[PDB]
C-alpha cells in the first residue's frame, strides 16, 4: 500500500480515487473531459472483445499431462514420444459453426486441439472428434464453412444452403454420414474420441519414415445425446459442455484418453488401396493395426479463460523434429492458415503470450512490431553476421520431406484401387451401425432435409442412395411424408431462407 | 464477360481459374506458395470476423420510415420533426449480455436503436425497451456489463455475480424490477415498446428549451413469454426474434410504433420532485402527459445483414440542430463511448460506409487514415485558410447548452424531494402489476436467486423488502424452500461458479 | 541446446533448419506453401512497422535519474519530489513535424518527454524546449499540425500553408517568435532547455494548492545552429542529434538539467495580470521567481531503440498524488489525446509493455483485449463485490480540483489586464534578443517568407509589425528584395505548392 | 446549405458549430466530455497515420497511359499488349531503405511500380531501376532489408552492418556493383530506366510459352548525381524527386519510357548458359535482343497523395491472362508477400479502394470483414450452388505453368555453364564503365568502407578483388589511406555503431 492509496489504481499505477463516480462540475454538473479514469476504463472496455475464431468460436479447455507408456522410438525421434516421457498439455474443445455464445449442444463436429509443451518446442496436434473430414482440397474449405454459417440477407442458418453444398461436393459423404450418425451429438467432451484425421509423417533417428494416424480413445467411452435431448439442453444450459468439463476437473474426476497410432511404411503410402493423403478416407485397422503410445490426462482448470483458452493459438505448423506434415493437400493448407488468422485475431506477437510460449529458448529472426513484450536487445538482425549471433543453415533434402513430380495443375487427386466418394460411408451405415442406430440415422437425415428446397432434396435422395440403396429409400420415404427429427441448431424453409 | 473469363475473378479482376482445386505439382504433389487465389480467399476468410458489439452483440434490424403527423414545431426546430416530414429510418434490435450466437429469448433488456436519415444529418435515437436503466453514473457501467457476462475462470454466466452487483448498487432496483417482471421476455421485437430513456433537450426556432422524453408505443401491443416458453424457444430456435422480424416484413406485415414525447419546460427541470437527469427515474404522466408526434413503420429487410446491420454504427452523439443532450451523466458518457468503440470494431472511417453516411453533404475536417474511400482532393487541411474552403466559427453560448457551477467532485447526484432508490420500483410492483403478474414475479425472482451464494441471497432479501415488504417476504419464503422458475440464460451454484 | 538444434528456432521453439534457403521441390522447383519458416518470418517482417507518432515521430532518448536536492514539501505531497528522493527516469527527445526518417536538424520545436518511475506510479512530464505554445485551445491543434506537414496533392511541406495558418491565428505570435529566433535550431538535445509549458497544480499534505511552472535548465548551456549549418548537417547526417546523444552517454559524458519551479498561490492564479492558464503566456520571473528542486542526469542508453523508445507511451494524464492538471484548455485536451493515440499506435495493452509499466503494483479494473500478457486470474470484474477484491470509492471534492461556473459555450478565454497576442513576443524581440540575434531573426523570417503567396506575405507583414514596428519593417524590406536565409526543412513557391 | 448550417459538419453531417473553440463551462471553465466535435476530430487525427511500407516507404507517383505500337501478339494473349491498345496507368517511384520522411537523394535502389488498368484486371509490373537484385532466395530478403535499416540499440544506419551482410552473401556482388556505380544516384526519376528484373512467363493464344524480361528505357536518358551533389540536395530539399515529378507534369513536360522485352523460347530457358531464374543474372542482348512493344507516358498528377499514392497497393500476384510468374524463387516469394503486407498496412478491403479497384467487374468469393464498402447483397457464399451465382472450375494443367520434379530440399539453385557470383559484376566494371566511372566507383566504394570494422573491411577487399583484381586493389589502397567520398544516407564507425 502506498501513502495515498485508495483501493485501486489507474493504468499508470496512481490511485484511481473512485471506481464508482465520474468527475463532474459540482454534483449536478457535466462530466469533464479530464476524467482520465473514466476514459481509460471505458476505452479498455471498448477494446475487450477480439474477433472470434473462424471456425470453432465456441469452446473451452483444460491443462493436463501426457505420459508415454510404450516404446515407439523405432518410428520417431520426437522427444515428446520417447520412452517414459511426461509432457504438460493444453487441450481446447469446441464446436465448428456456431459463434461465441451459441449453444454447446448443437449437432456439429467437435474440435480436439492438443498442445504438448515439449523440450524441443510446442507441438500442436490440432484434431477433431472424427478421423475424416468433408473435403480433400483446401480451396473448398472457405465455401464449406460459409455454407454452415448464415445466409447473407437474413442472417439465419439454413439447411438448404448446407445440403446444396454437400450434395454438390460428393466427397463430403463419408463425414456427413459420421456427423448424422450418433457421434454428431457428444454427451460431453469427456465422452468422445479425438483424432488427428490427417496422415502425418514420423521420422526416426536413422531417417526412416512412416506415415502415421493418431487416435485418442476416451477411457470414459463414447456417449451421445439424441436430437431431442440436445435441443432441450441447448435451451436450459447453452454452456453445458463447458460447465461439465470445469466441474468434473474441479471435483477431481480427471478425464483420460489413450493414444494409439497406425504406422504405414513410407513406400506403402504410395500404393495402398485407399489414399492415405485423402482426408475423406479412413485406413483399415485390419491392414494397419492400432499401436499404443501412452495416456493423456486432463487435470487442471484455467485460472483465466480469456488469457489461457480464448487467446491460445494452435497451429498444425507447430511441428517438432521427428514429426512432419504429409502430401495431404488439406494439411498443407492448414500449415499456412492458422498462423495467418492469429495475426489478425490476437496480434503479431501472439506467440509471446504465456500460454503460447514454448518451454525452451526461442532464438528466432523476428523483431519489432506492435506489443513486442520480450525484445532481443542488441542481437544482430541479419545473417550471416560477424557478431556471434547464431543462425540456421542446413542444406539439402529435409528429414521430413518427400518427392514430387509433375506439371502445375488444378485437378482432383488420382484414385487408388478402392477410392471413391461413397464406399466407406456405406460401410459405416451397413456394417458398423446397429439397427437402432440406422433407425435414428433415418430420422436425423429426414429431419435435416425437412423444409429444404425441393430441387436440393431431390439431389439429396440420389446422394443417400449412393451411400446405401436401402437407407436412401427409407430417407426419401420419410422426407416425402414430412417426418423426421428437429435438428439442434438448424432448420430450413420459410420466407427468411432459401 | 472477358475473352479469357472462367466464371469468377481474383481481387484484381483477373479470372480466378478455379474456386474448387488448389495449384499443385502434379495431381499428387504439394501446393505451391504462388496459388494466389488460395491465398487471397483464405486470408480474407481469416479476416471476415470483426469484434462483436459490447454490449448488444446479438441483434438484427430493418429499414423503414417515420412520418410526422402532429405539429410540435413549438418545441423543436429539428427538420426531422417539422410538420408533415417523412424520413427514412434504420432500426436495430438486440439483447444486451449475450454474444453473437446466443439465443434471442434469454431474459434481458432489449435494444431499440433508431436512425433517422435527416436532411441535416443522421439523427440517432439509441434507446432500449425500458424507460429507465440500472445506473445513474457511467463509471459503474463497465462493472455492470462485466457482471452480466462471464466469470473469469470458468467462462460461465453466474447469477451470484449478477446479484452481488445489483444488491451493492441499490440504484438498480427500478430497472431490476422492470426486467424481472413480464417485460423481461418480449414475445417478438414487434410486440415491445421502445424508449429513449434519457431526458434530451429540444430547442425551438426562438431558442426556447424543453426537456423531453421519448416513448415509442407499439401498435402491435406488448406481449411477453413465460420463463418456460422462452427457455423452450432458446433450444428450438436461437434466432427466433431475428427470424420473426425478417419473415413478418417479407410477408408484408409492417410493424408500427407511435412516437410520443413528454415535454418539461426548462426551468421546471431543475425543480421537479423526481430528478429528470437521473436515468433510474420515470417522469409521471399525470405531471407531464404524453404528446403525439408521429408514426414509425418498418417496411424493408436488409439485402446484406453484415454490411447493413452488423456494420451499422449508432451513436447518441449523432444529434441534429434542435436536439441536444442533457445533464444526465449516463448520456454524457455515451456521447464519448460509442464512436470510440466503433473506431476499434469497424474502423476509423466507419462513417463512410454506406449505411452510416448521411444524405446531406459532409464537409468535415478529417483526412487520411486507413481505408479512406471518399477522399477530399486538394481541399485545405487547416482553418482559417485563404483558399475558399469553409469552416465553422460560431462563438458564444451554444443553443443546446445549460448552466453549471461547482467544484470538481466525484459524488452522487443531489436528491430531489421524492428521489430514492426503491419508491418507483415499489409503485410498479404494488400498483401497476396485476395479481397474476405479481405471482409470476415472485417465481421469477426466487428462481433467479436459486443456488446464489447465501450471503448474497441474504442481501437480496433486504433489497426486495425495500422495494415492497410483502413481495420481499414472498420471495424470501420461496427461496428458503428452493422453489422458483428456471431463468433463460443464467443460473447459479456448482463448482464452476461463485 | 536441444538434440536436433540447428542454430535458430521458429516461433514455437522448434529448430528452423535454415535462415537462408526456402523449401523447394528440388533445387530448380517452386517454393511450397508449407515453408512455415518462410511464412512466419515474412509475415512478421510485414508487421514490424507501426504507425509513427503524430506529431513528434522523429526522436530518441535515454534513461537516467532525478535527485531532489531541495525541500519543496511545503508545495507538494508527491513522493517523487520529497526531500532526498532519487527516481529512475526515461527521457525522449524529438522534433514535431517531420516523419520517422526526416532529418534531426530541421527548424522546429523539440519535444522533452520525461517519465519518472515513482513509488506511487509513473509520473509523465511531457514538455517541449519552449515555455509556451502556438495555441490556447485544443480544437486548433489538429489544424496547426496538419499545416506544418504536407500539402494534400503534392505531398510537400509548404511555407505558404504554414504562414496562412499562423497569420490567421495571431495567438501564435509568441511561439512563432521563439521558433524563428536562435532556439529554433538546437545544436544538440544536450544544449537546450526543457519546460513543462503549462501551469500544473501542486497539492501539499494539508490540501493547500499552488499553480506551478516547470523549467529544466541545461547544465551544458543553450547552444544553437545557424540555418546554413543546420541545412548542411541535414544532408551529411540526418540523425545528428540521435547519434550525439547515444555517443555522449556511451563515452560517459552524462548530460544534466536542473529543475526549477515557479509557484503561484492558488488565489493569485485567478487575478494575475497575465493568464497562467493561457499556454501562449510566460509568467514573469520578477513576479514569481524560480525555486530550485533538483537535478536530472541522463546516464544510460537503451538496449533496444524500438522496444524502449519507439514503443514508449507518454501521457500528461499520468499524474501522481500531489500533482494535478489545471484549467489550461490545451492541457485538458492532452489528458484525453495521448492515451487514445496509443491504443491505435501500439495497442490496448500499451501500458503492460515493460517500458510503460510502473514500479508499484497495478490493481486496475480492466480485463481482456488483444495481447493481454499479465492477466488477473480469477479476480472479480465488478465493484462492489463480496469477494475481497478491493476498489476505490472516495466521495466528494477531489484534492486536485478547482471551481467553475458558467453556461456551455465556445469562446475565447477572458483577457487579464495585460493579456494580448503580441506583447510578450515584442518583449522577446526588443529586450531579450541581442542586436546580432535580431539581425539573424530578420534573415530567418524573411527567408521563411520567400516564395510565399503574396496575399499571405502581406498579412505576415502586418503580423510582424504588431510584434514590433521596427523588426516588422526590416522583414518587409528584405522580403520585397527577395532576400533571406534558406530554412532547413521547408520552402515555398513553384508549381507543386500554393 | 442547410437552414442551420455553420460552415462545416461533424461526421454525421450535422453542423459542427466551431472548428476553432472547444466546449467549456463558461469562458474560464473546463472542457466537457460531450464536446463530440473535439472528440471526433482528435480521434481521427490520432488514426491518420498508417504503417509505412517496408521497404520503399519514401515515394511518389503519377498517372499516365501506355500505348502499344508494335505487334507482339505472337508472344502473348494479354489484352493489355494487343496491337493498338491504350491503357491507363499509375506509377509509383520510391527509394528502398529510408523511412517516410527520409531524403529522396540517398544512394539506394529505386522502385518502379507500374499498374495497368486493363480490361481483364489490374496488371501490376512491380519493378526497380535495375535489371537484377542482391539475392536469389526470398528467405534472405528479410535479413537484407533489416541490414539496410537501423541498428537495434542506437537506431542508426550502419555501413558495417550493410557490408557484413553483403560480404557474407556473395550473390549480392552483381547488384552491389550496380548500386555503387553511377546509377546509385538518379538525378530525377524521369532520368532513370525501369526494369521488371525477373523473368516472367508470356503465353500466347495457342498456348505457346516464352520467358520474358521487361526493360523500360527512359526517353529522357539516364542522368545521375555525384555523392557530393546528392548529399547537398538531401539537406536543401529532402523531397527533391517528389517535387521534380509533380512540377514537371504540372508544366506539361510529360516523361516517357519505351518498353522493350527479351523473349526466350520455353525450352531454351532450361538450358541457357546463365540461369534466367536467378535474379542476380542479366541475359545477354547478343543472345536475346530487345524487341519494342510500346511507350509509357506520365501525364497526370494525383489530386490526393495519400488516397491515390500512399494507399495504392501493388502486387506481382496481380497478373492477367497471358502473363504468368516463373520458377524464380524471389518472384514466387513476392507472390505471397505484398498482399499479406497490405492487409496489415491498409486493411482487408485494400482492393476496394478506388485506386486499387479494377475497371472490369469483380466477381470474387470474399465476403464481410472490416470496412466492407461494396457488399455482395444476397449472392451465394459457396460453390457449387443451385442459385445461379457463377464460379470457376477449370481442371487440369494451367496455361501459365511449368514442370518440376525432385525431393523437398533447402539448397542453392544448380549452376548453369557460366553462372557464378562475380563474373557479370566484373564485366560491368571492366567493359561497361568508362575510365571516369571506374575512378568514381573506387571513391564511392572506398568511402562506403570508411570506418567499417576492420575484419569486415578485410572481407570486403577479398569480395572486390573477386569482382576485379585491379579495381579491388585500388579500393583496398584507398581504404588503407582512409580516403573516399561521403555516401549520402549512411556512414560507419563511432561509439553508436558496430
Ligand atoms: C522476395 C523478395 C521481395 C520481397 C519479399 C518483397 C517484399 C515487399 C513488400 C512486403 C513491399 C511492401 C508492399 C506494400 O506494403 O504495399 C515491397 C515493396 C516494393 N518492392 Fe518488393 N520485395 C521483394 C523484392 C523486390 C524486387 C526484386 C523488386 C523489383 C523487381 C521489388 C520492388 C518493390 C517495389 C517497387 C516496392 C514499392 C511498391 C510501391 O511503390 O508501393 N521488390 N516489397
C385 and B29: CB-CB below 8 Å? no
Q: What is the DSSP letter of B282?
A: -
Cβ-based burial of A51 (10 A; exposed 0-12, middle 13-18, buried ≥19): buried
How many other CB atoms sit within 10 Å of the CB of residue B176?
24
Strand partners, B112: B93, B127
How far apart, in Å, are the Cα atoms of D325 and each of B36, D213, D316, D319?
11, 11, 8, 8
Q: In degrees, to the nearest 5, what angle opens at C-alpha C130 toward C-alphas C125 and C136?
A: 85
Q: Is A338 annotated as a binding residue?
A: yes
- Nearest-angstrom CA–CA distance, A50 and C367: 12
How many structural domains are present in chain D?
Answer: 1
Residue C411 touches partner B, C-beta closer than 8 Å: yes
End-to-end alpha-carbon separation of chain A, Å? 63
Instruction: List all residues 6 or more positions away from C359 whose beta carbon is below 8 Å from its beta carbon.
Output: A13, C88, C117, C118, C119
Q: Is B304 a catalytic residue?
A: no
* Residue D75 near ligand 1, beta carbon < 6 Å: no
For residues C417 and D194, give the distance between their C-alpha atoms in angstroms, rounded to a whole number: 66
CATH code for the domain in which residue B56 is found: 2.40.180.10
Alpha-carbon span C452 to C458, nearest angstrom: 10
The answer to whether the beta carbons of residues A87 and A211 sit under 8 Å apart is: no
Closest CA to D306 of D102, D8, D50: D50
Q: What is the DSSP letter of B432?
A: I
Host H or E run for residue C41: helix C36-45
State the pairing for strand pair D86-94/D111-118: antiparallel
Residues D257, D258, D261: CA angle, nearest 5 degrees: 130
The whole-angstrom separation of Cα D59 and Cα D112 is 10
- Of D113, D115, D126, the one to substitute when testing ligand 1's pocket (max ligand atoms within 8 A of C-beta) is D126
Query: To probe the interface with B, which of D34, D340, D349, D379 has the most B CB atoms within 10 Å?
Result: D34
CA atoms of B293 and D122, how far apart (whole Å)? 53
Phi, psi torsion values for B124, nearest 5 degrees: -105, 125
Within 10 angstroms of residue D384's Cβ, the number of other Cβ atoms is 18
* CB-based burial, B429-438: b 16+ in 10 Å, e otherwise: beeebeeebb
What residues pair up with A194 in beta bridges, in sequence order?
A: A216
Strand pairing category for D403-410 and A396-397: antiparallel
As given in the structure block, the three cell numbers for residue C439 are 539581425
Residues C119, A3: contact at Cβ < 8 Å?
Answer: no
**How many other C-beta atoms can be found within 10 angstroms of the C-beta atom of residue B346?**
22
SS3 D118: strand
Q: Is B380 exposed, middle or buried, given 0-12, 13-18 or 19+ CB atoms closer than 10 A?
A: buried
- The answer, for C392 touching chain B at a CB cutoff of 8 Å, is no
- Indicate the residue of D51, D406, D494 with minimum beta-carbon distance to C51: D51
Contact B115, B89 (CB under 8 A): yes
- The CB of D322 under 6 Å from ligand 1? The reply is no
CA-based torsion, C344, C347, C349, C352: positive or negative? negative
Distance from CA of A275 to the nearest CA of C (A): 20
Contact A51 B54 (CB under 8 A): no
Which cell numbers in the block locate residue B47?
479476416
Q: How far is C44 from chain B (nearest CA, A)?
A: 15
Q: Is D53 in the pocket of ligand 1 (CB under 6 A)?
A: yes
Work out the angle between the directed axes of helices B454-467 and B173-180 (0-180°, nearest 10): 90
Task: Name residues whose C-beta falls within 8 Å of residue C413's C-beta, 6 or more positions apart in sequence.
Answer: C136, C275, C277, C278, C329, D27, D28
- Which residue is associated with the grid cell 491543434? C141
Contact C278, C222 (CB under 8 A): no
CA distances from D451 to B82, D106, D230, D456, D480 (A): 78, 19, 21, 10, 11
Query: What is the H or E stretch that residue B123 is in?
Result: strand B121-128
Alpha-carbon gap, residue C72 to C68, rounded angstroms:
9
At residue B182, what are phi and psi to the nearest 5 degrees?
Answer: -55, -35
d(CA C389, CA C384): 9
Count how many pairs of residues, chain C against chain D, have C-beta atoms within 8 Å: 329
Structure-block grid coordinates of residue C309: 523508445
Selected catalytic residue, list B56, B198, B210, B215: B56
CB contact under 8 A, D153 and A377: yes
Measure the CA–CA gap between B87 and B67, rounded to whole angstroms. 7
Cβ neighbours of residue D75 closer than 8 Å, sequence gap 6 or more:
D202, D204, D210, D212, D261, D263
Atom of ligand 1 nearest to the CA of D196: 30
Q: How many residues does chain C have?
A: 498
Q: Residue B151 C-alpha to ligand 1 middle, in angstroms? A: 47
Checking phi first, is residue D153 left (phi over 0); if not, alpha (psi -120 to 50) or beta? alpha
The reply to whether ligand 1 has any atom less than 6 angstroms from the CB of D213 is no
How many residues are there in chain D? 498
Q: What phi and psi values does residue C94 have, to the nearest 5 degrees?
A: -165, 160
Whether residue B50 lies within 8 A of chain C, CB to CB, comes out as no
| Separation between Cα atoms, residue A49 and residue B342, nearest integer Å | 12
Query: Per the structure block, which three cell numbers stand in for B424?
Result: 418507483
Contacts with C406 from chain B: Cβ below 8 Å: 403-405
Angle at D200 between CA D199 and CA D204, to 5 degrees: 135
- Full 3-state SS string of B340-380: HHHHHHCCCCHHHCHHHCCCCCCCCCCCCCCCCCCCCCCCC
What is the CA(D226)–ligand 1 centre distance, in A?
A: 26
Identify whether the C-beta of residue C120 lies closer than 8 Å to the C-beta of residue A14: yes
Rounded to the nearest whole angstrom, what is the distance from the C-alpha of residue D313 to the centroid of ligand 1?
10
C-alpha of B396 from chain center: 34
| N-term to C-term CA, chain C | 63
Grid coordinates of B198? 434519457
Task: Note if the bond before B384 is cis, omega within 30 degrees.
Answer: yes
E-state strands within A193-272: 194-195, 200-203, 209-218, 256-265
* Count of other CB atoms within 10 angstroms of residue C437: 16
What letter does residue C303 receive in the DSSP assignment? S
CA distances to C165, C176, C181 from C443, rounded to whole Å, are: 21, 15, 10
Task: Identify the closest residue of chain B to D120 by CA–CA distance.
Answer: B14
Comparing C-alpha atoms, which of B51, B48, B154, B149 is closest to residue B100? B51
Residue found under cell 487427386: A413
Task: Report the alpha-carbon distance of residue C3 to residue A205 in Å, rounded.
Answer: 11
Instruction: Kindly give, in sequence order, each residue whose CB lies less than 8 Å from that of residue C2, ignoring residues fewer than 6 positions away.
Output: A79, A119, A120, A360, C15
Does ligand 1 come within 6 angstroms of the Cβ of D110? Answer: no
User: Cβ of D4 under 8 Å from any chain A Cβ?
Assistant: no
Measured CA to CA in angstroms, residue A55 lies from A52, A109, A270, B44, D325 at distances of 8, 11, 32, 13, 33
Resolution (A): 1.7
Instruction: Report the nearest atom of ligand 1 relative to the CA of D53.
Output: 15
Residue B176 is placed in which grid cell? 431490476
Domain, as residue range, for D415: 1-498
**Chain D neighbors of B20, CB-CB under 8 A:** 383, 391-393
Q: Does D344 touch chain B (CB under 8 A)?
A: no
The reply to whether residue A382 touches residue D161, judged by beta carbons under 8 angstroms, is yes
Comparing C-alpha atoms, which of A218, A199, A204 is closest to residue A257? A218
Instruction: Report the C-alpha gap between A149 and A128 in whole angstroms.
Output: 19
CB atoms within 10 A of CB B59: 25
Q: Select from D40, D45, A346, A489 the least CA-distant residue to B51.
A: A346
Q: Which residues in chain A have Cβ-Cβ distances shorter than 8 Å to D158?
A: none
Question: What 3-state class would DSSP assign to D119?
Answer: coil
Method: X-ray
Q: Is D337 in the pocket of ligand 1 (CB under 6 A)?
A: yes
Interface contact A385, partner D, CB < 8 A: yes
Q: Counting runs of H as helices and runs of E as strands, what totals does chain B give?
A: 13, 13
The region, left, alpha or beta by phi > 0 then psi within -120 to 50, assigned to residue B369 is left
H or E, element range at B202: strand B200-203
SS3 annotation, D40-72: HHHHHHCCCCCCCCCCCCCEEEEEEEEEECCCC
Binding-site residues from annotation of B for heme: 338
| D449 touches D163 (CB < 8 A) | yes
Q: Are D290 and D99 in contact (CB under 8 A)?
A: no
- Measured distance CA(A313)–CA(C378) in Å, rounded: 21
Q: Is some CB atom of chain A closer than 8 A to the CB atom of D329? A: no
H/E/C letters for each residue in C111-151? EEEEEEEECCEEEEEEEECCCCCCCCCHHHHHHHHHHHCEC
Cβ-based burial of B251 (10 A; exposed 0-12, middle 13-18, buried ≥19):
exposed
Q: Are C18 and A392 in contact (CB under 8 A)?
A: yes
Residue A391: closest CA among A378, A382, A404, A401: A382
Just list the catalytic residues of A.
Answer: 56, 128
- Which DSSP helix (H) or strand (E) runs through D176? helix D173-180
Tell me whether strands A396-397 and B24-25 are parallel, antiparallel or unpaired.
unpaired
Q: How many CB atoms lie within 10 A of CB C141?
A: 21
In whole angstroms, what is the distance from residue D477 CA to residue D482 CA?
9
Antiparallel, parallel or unpaired: β A111-118 and A396-397: unpaired
Rounded to a whole number of angstroms, the distance from the CA of B59 to the nearest CA of chain D is 17
Amino acid at each position: 500500500t502506498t501513502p495515498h492509496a485508495t483501493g485501486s489504481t489507474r493504468q499508470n499505477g496512481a490511485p484511481a480515487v473512485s471506481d464508482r463516480q465520474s468527475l463532474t462540475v459540482g454534483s449536478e454538473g457535466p462530466i469533464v473531459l479530464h476524467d482520465t479514469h473514466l476514459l481509460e476504463t471505458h476505452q479498455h472496455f471498448n477494446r475487450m472483445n477480439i474477433p472470434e475464431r473462424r471456425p470453432h468460436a465456441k469452446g473451452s479447455g483444460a491443462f493436463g499431462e501426457f505420459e508415454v507408456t510404450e516404446d515407439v522410438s523405432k518410428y520417431t525421434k520426437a522427444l515428446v514420444f520417447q520412452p517414459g516421457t511426461k509432457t504438460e498439455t493444453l487441450l481446447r474443445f469446441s464446436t465448428v459453426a456456431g459463434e461465441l455464445g451459441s449453444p454447446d449442444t448443437w449437432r456439429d463436429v467437435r474440435g480436439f486441439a492438443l498442445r504438448f509443451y515439449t523440450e524441443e518446442g510446442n507441438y500442436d496436434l490440432v484434431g477433431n472428434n472424427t478421423p475424416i473430414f468433408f473435403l480433400r482440397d483446401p480451396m473448398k474449405f472457405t465455401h464449406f464453412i460459409r455454407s454452415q454459417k448464415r445466409l447473407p440477407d437474413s442472417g439465419l442458418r439454413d439447411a438448404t444452403m448446407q445440403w446444396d453444398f454437400w450434395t454438390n461436393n460428393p466427397e463430403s459423404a463419408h463425414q456427413v454420414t459420421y456427423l448424422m450418425g450418433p457421434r454428431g451429438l457428444p454427451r460431453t467432451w469427456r465422452e468422445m474420441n479425438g483424432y488427428g484425421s490427417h496422415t502425418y509423417l514420423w521420422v526416426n533417428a536413422q531417417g526412416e519414415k512412416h506415415w502415421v494416424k493418431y487416435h485418442f480413445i476416451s477411457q470414459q467411452g463414447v456417449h451421445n445425446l439424441s436430437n431431442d435431448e440436445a435441443t432441450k439442453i441447448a435451451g436450459e444450459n447453452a454452456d453445458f459442455h463447458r460447465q461439465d468439463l470445469f466441474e468434473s476437473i474441479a471435483k477431481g474426476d480427471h478425464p483420460k484418453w489413450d493414444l494409439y497410432i497406425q504406422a504405414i511404411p513410407y513406400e506403402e503410402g504410395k500404393t495402398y488401396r485407399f489414399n492415405p493423403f485423402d482426408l475423406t478416407k479412413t485406413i483399415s485397422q485390419k491392414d494397419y493395426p492400432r499401436i499404443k503410445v501412452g495416456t493423456l490426462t486432463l487435470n487442471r482448470n484455467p485460472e483465466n479463460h480469456f488469457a489461457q483458452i480464448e487467446s491460445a493459438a494452435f497451429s498444425p505448423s507447430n511441428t517438432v523434429p521427428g514429426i512432419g506434415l504429409s502430401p495431404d493437400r488439406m494439411l498443407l493448407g492448414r500449415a499456412f492458415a492458422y498462423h495467418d488468422a492469429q495475426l489478425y485475431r490476437v496480434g503479431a506477437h501472439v506467440n509471446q503470450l504465456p500460454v503460447n510460449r514454448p518451454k525452451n529458448a526461442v532464438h528466432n529472426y523476428a523483431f519489432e512490431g506492435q506489443m513486442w513484450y520480450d525484445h532481443t536487445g542488441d542481437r544482430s538482425t541479419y545473417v550471416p553476421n560477424s557478431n556471434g549471433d547464431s543462425w540456421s543453415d542446413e542444406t539439402g533434402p529435409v528429414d521430413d520431406g518427400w518427392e514430387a513430380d509433375g506439371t502445375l495443375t488444378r485437378e482432383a487427386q488420382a484414385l487408388r484401387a478402392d477410392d471413391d466418394d461413397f464406399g466407406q460411408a456405406g460401410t459405416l451405415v451397413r456394417e458398423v451401425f446397429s439397427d437402432q442406430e440406422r433407425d435414428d440415422f433415418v430420422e436425423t437425415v429426414a429431419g435435416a432435409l425437412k423444409g429444404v428446397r425441393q430441387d436440393v432434396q431431390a439431389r439429396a435422395f440420389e446422394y443417400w442412395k449412393n451411400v446405401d440403396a436401402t437407407i436412401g429409400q427409407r430417407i426419401e420415404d420419410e422426407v416425402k411424408r414430412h417426418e423426421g427429427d428437429g435438428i439442434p441448431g438448424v432448420e430450413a424453409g420459410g420466407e427468411a431462407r432459401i
